[PDB]
Design a protein around this ligand. Structure first.
Ligand SMILES: [Zn+2]
Length: 286
C-alpha cells in the first residue's frame, strides 16, 4: 500500500501500551508510533484526547485488541475510528484475530468475549504475528526487517511460555487460585493451569461494590489461599478491603491491562508476563 522509502515513515496508532510495546519490538525505528491509553489507565473505558484524534486520523495503520476490550464508554474505540473515517481491515486491525476466544462466563455470543487474551503467551505471539503481517502489507520495503524482528521476538516469547508451563505444579491445590480485582485471568488460567477468581468480572461493570467484595470474601473464607494480587490499572481500594476482611495479604501489584511505567519492572509485554509469572508463583507458595 505505501512506498515509505519515497516518503514518511508509516504512521501507526495502538490503543494501549501492551499492543504498542509488541509493535515497537516488531517495527523499531521504522515507524512513527502513538499509543492512546496511558500506562496505568483502564483501556476498557477511555475518552480520547485531541492528540489521539489527530494521530488516529493521520494514521496509516491502527491496531486495537478487539474481542470486547475497547467497548466501554458506549464503544469508545468504535466512535474514534468512525470520527477518523477509518475502515476495518483496511486501516484498523484487531490483533487478537486468530486467537482461540474465551467468552465471559455463561455467554457465548459475539461482543461478549473476554478480552484478556494476551495473558496467555501463545496469544501474545499471535498478536505479534498479526502486527508484523499488517506492517509488511502496508510497508513492503521493510518486510524482511519486520519478519526478522518477528522471528526473534516470538522465539523469546516462546521460550518463556514453554519454560512457564513448569511454574505452578508445586503449589498445593488449596492454595492454587489467582485472585485479582477484575476477572482478567481466564486465558492465563487455561494456559498455565491455575484457576482464578475476582471481585468484578470485567471493568465495564460496577466498580467494586460492597456486594461484590462480600461475595469474594465469603468464597475466600472457604479456602487456604495465601496471597491476593492487585492490578496496576484498577483502584486498589476494593482488594484492600477484601484483603482486610479475609486476613489474606496482597502479595504484589501485577499487570493485566497495561505494562508498567518506563524504567520499572514490567515495562514491556515480555517483562510484564515474566514478572506476573514469577510473582504469582512466589505469592501462591506462601
Ligand atoms: Zn481488563
Amino acid at each position: 500500500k505505501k512506498d515509505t522509502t519515497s516518503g514518511q515513515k508509516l504512521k501507526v496508532v495502538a490503543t494501549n501500551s501492551i499492543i504498542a510495546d509488541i509493535t515497537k519490538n516488531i517495527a523499531g525505528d521504522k515507524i512513527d508510533l502513538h499509543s492512546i491509553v496511558p500506562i496505568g489507565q483502564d483501556p476498557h473505558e477511555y475518552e480520547p484526547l485531541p492528540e489521539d484524534v489527530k494521530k488516529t486520523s493521520e494514521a496509516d495503520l491502527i491496531f486495537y485488541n478487539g474481542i470486547n476490550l475497547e467497548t466501554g464508554g458506549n464503544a469508545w474505540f468504535t466512535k474514534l475510528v468512525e470520527n477518523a473515517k477509518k475502515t476495518e481491515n483496511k486501516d484498523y486491525f484487531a490483533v487478537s484475530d486468530g486467537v482461540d476466544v474465551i467468552y465471559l462466563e455463561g455467554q457465548n455470543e459475539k461482543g461478549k468475549e473476554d478480552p484478556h487474551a494476551w495473558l496467555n503467551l501463545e496469544n501474545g505471539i499471535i498478536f505479534a504475528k498479526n502486527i508484523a503481517k499488517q506492517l509488511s502489507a502496508k510497508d513492503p520495503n521493510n518486510k524482511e526487517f519486520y519478519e526478522k524482528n518477528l522471528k526473534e521476538y516470538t522465539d523469546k516469547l516462546d521460550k518463556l511460555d514453554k519454560e512457564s508451563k513448569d511454574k505452578f505444579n508445586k503449589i498445593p491445590a488449596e492454595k492454587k487460585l489467582i485472585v485479582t480485582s477484575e476477572g482478567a485471568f481466564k486465558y492465563f488460567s487455561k494456559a498455565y493451569g491455575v484457576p482464578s477468581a475476582y471481585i468484578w468480572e470485567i471493568n465495564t461493570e460496577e466498580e467494586g461494590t460492597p456486594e461484590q467484595i462480600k461475595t469474594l470474601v465469603e468464597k475466600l473464607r472457604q479456602t487456604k489461599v495465601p496471597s491476593l494480587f492487585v492490578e496496576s490499572s484498577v483502584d486498589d481500594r476494593p482488594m484492600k478491603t477484601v484483603s482486610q476482611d479475609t486476613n489474606i495479604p496482597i502479595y504484589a501489584q501485577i499487570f493485566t491491562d497495561s505494562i508498567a511505567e518506563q524504567g520499572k519492572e514490567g515495562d514491556s509485554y515480555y517483562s510484564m508476563m515474566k514478572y506476573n509469572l514469577d510473582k504469582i508463583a512466589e505469592g501462591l507458595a506462601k
